[PDB]
């Protein structure tokens, strides 16, 4: 249900979709192809759902990290530009959009989070994070808040968590180690501890999301925010006298923003592949094409050599890139979505008080690694019916903590009924039955109707 002879593009909401729409109009009456730009919610999870059944957009615009995941599902068509086109862009930005050696998207621009401050409210910005509590109770007197940023997305809070010692996956021998997740070490705790300290002291609202912190800075109510290059145009509309600068440093260590490369991937199920190609290559990735989007919302540092020479002299890009230099580029492995979600959970729970940091982070460790919880790791080993020819249900646990050992498919598995003297678990003469199904998955339901 995604038609031919027309281009439908999906970009994030905060990006320059209007500038991209202007590039669409230029392309519309140059060939004769209808180009329309949409910006839907949860776009980065919508796409792998709609496109997975042949029906996504033609082009999708996201940070390079999500693309690795999509690539694996084969939602993205592999793009082959002649080596002569690849010269227009910086050679290293092509690596960002590489998965299994296949080039999967076109690198557009580099964005990293920067500390934006109000030159008027705060003349000299804070070098460290520890001085913010001190420099808030000062501003709170004069009816203002010191620091406000989106606490709802991990992309924003992670630079702080990462500052001391935290990281996603350890880069070992030209690769990423997926069992090794440092989302919960000493440095990661110190980061999230101090972040909660700001909430459980009324320095920052744990409610605060994007448009809230966005509107407040533009009204002139908050001293500092943390945002990306896209944010700059609304701060211009409001005509605040502002400065983009390096993020504060926590425990002497610099803050480590994860750095994204905005990329454009072509939908595999799309029939308009070459049509899209000529749009991106010939129209979008060019001086005017990138100027249009940058006119709408600033892109950060672009990947296009020619245009970047110009953007380079902008003092705001200088600070953006100086921040990116302290941080790391995102991995584009599929385990990233797990990591991101693993942290969203943790930061949310810690913020609301739902969990103490150590608890929230231990869960985050489990989630990002995608392993069993401490409680359940002992099910892993179990497979009391094994050395298996054919399909299997892998050792799993159910919602009571009953291990279901690895079994060949199409077989009724039996395990003793749990019972509980208060917390204390024990086994009865009775049996819980569960079928390891013919297709290799455990039956959703465990028949526990005999343990009375």
């Amino acid at each position: 249900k995604i038609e031919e002879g027309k281009l439908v593009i999906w970009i994030n909401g905060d990006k320059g979709y209007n500038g991209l729409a202007e590039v669409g109009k230029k392309f519309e009456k140059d060939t004769g192809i209808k180009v329309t730009v949409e910006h839907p919610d949860k776009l980065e999870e919508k796409f792998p759902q709609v496109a997975a059944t042949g029906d996504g957009p033609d082009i999708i615009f996201w940070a390079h990290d999500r693309f690795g995941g999509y690539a694996q599902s084969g939602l993205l068509a592999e793009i082959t530009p002649d080596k002569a086109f690849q010269d227009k862009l910086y050679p290293e930005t092509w690596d960002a959009v590489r998965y299994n050696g296949k080039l999967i998207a076109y690198p557009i621009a580099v964005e990293a989070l920067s500390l934006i401050y109000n030159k008027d409210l705060l003349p000299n910005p804070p070098k460290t994070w520890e001085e913010i509590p001190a420099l808030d109770k000062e501003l709170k007197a004069k009816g203002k808040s010191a620091l406000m940023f989106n606490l709802q997305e991990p992309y924003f809070t992670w630079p702080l968590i990462a500052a001391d010692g935290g990281y996603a996956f350890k880069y070992e021998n030209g690769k990423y180690d997926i069992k090794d997740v440092g989302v919960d070490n000493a440095g990661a705790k110190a980061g999230l501890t101090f972040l909660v300290d700001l909430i459980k002291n009324k320095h920052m609202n744990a409610d605060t999301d994007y448009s809230i912190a966005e509107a407040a800075f533009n009204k002139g109510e908050t001293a500092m925010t943390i945002n990306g290059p896209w944010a700059w145009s609304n701060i211009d509309t409001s005509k605040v006298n502002y400065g983009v600068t390096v993020l504060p440093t926590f425990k002497g260590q610099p803050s480590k923003p994860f750095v994204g490369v905005l990329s454009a991937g072509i939908n595999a199920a799309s029939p308009n592949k070459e049509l899209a190609k000529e749009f991106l290559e010939n129209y979008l990735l060019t001086d005017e094409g990138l100027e249009a989007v940058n006119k709408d919302k600033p892109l950060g540092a672009v990947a296009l050599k020619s245009y970047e020479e110009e953007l380079a002299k902008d003092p705001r890009i200088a600070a953006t890139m100086e921040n990116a230099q302290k941080g790391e580029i995102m991995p584009n492995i599929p385990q990233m979505s797990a990591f991101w979600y693993a942290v969203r959970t943790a930061v949310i729970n810690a913020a609301s008080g739902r969990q103490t940091v150590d608890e929230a982070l231990k869960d985050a460790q489990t989630n990002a690694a995608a392993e069993f919880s401490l409680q359940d790791q002992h099910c892993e080993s179990l497979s009391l019916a094994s050395n298996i020819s054919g399909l299997q249900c892998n050792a799993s646990v159910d919602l009571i903590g009953t291990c279901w050992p690895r079994s060949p498919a199409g077989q009724l598995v039996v395990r003793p009924c749990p019972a509980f003297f208060y917390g204390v678990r024990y086994n009865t003469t009775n049996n819980g039955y569960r079928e390891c199904l013919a297709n290799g998955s455990w039956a959703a339901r465990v028949n526990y109707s005999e343990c009375q």
Partner: peptide
């Protein structure tokens, strides 16, 4: 126990 019979009926 009780909040665990309730669980086991659903589970």
């Amino acid at each position: 126990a009780h909040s665990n019979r309730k669980l086991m009926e659903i589970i």
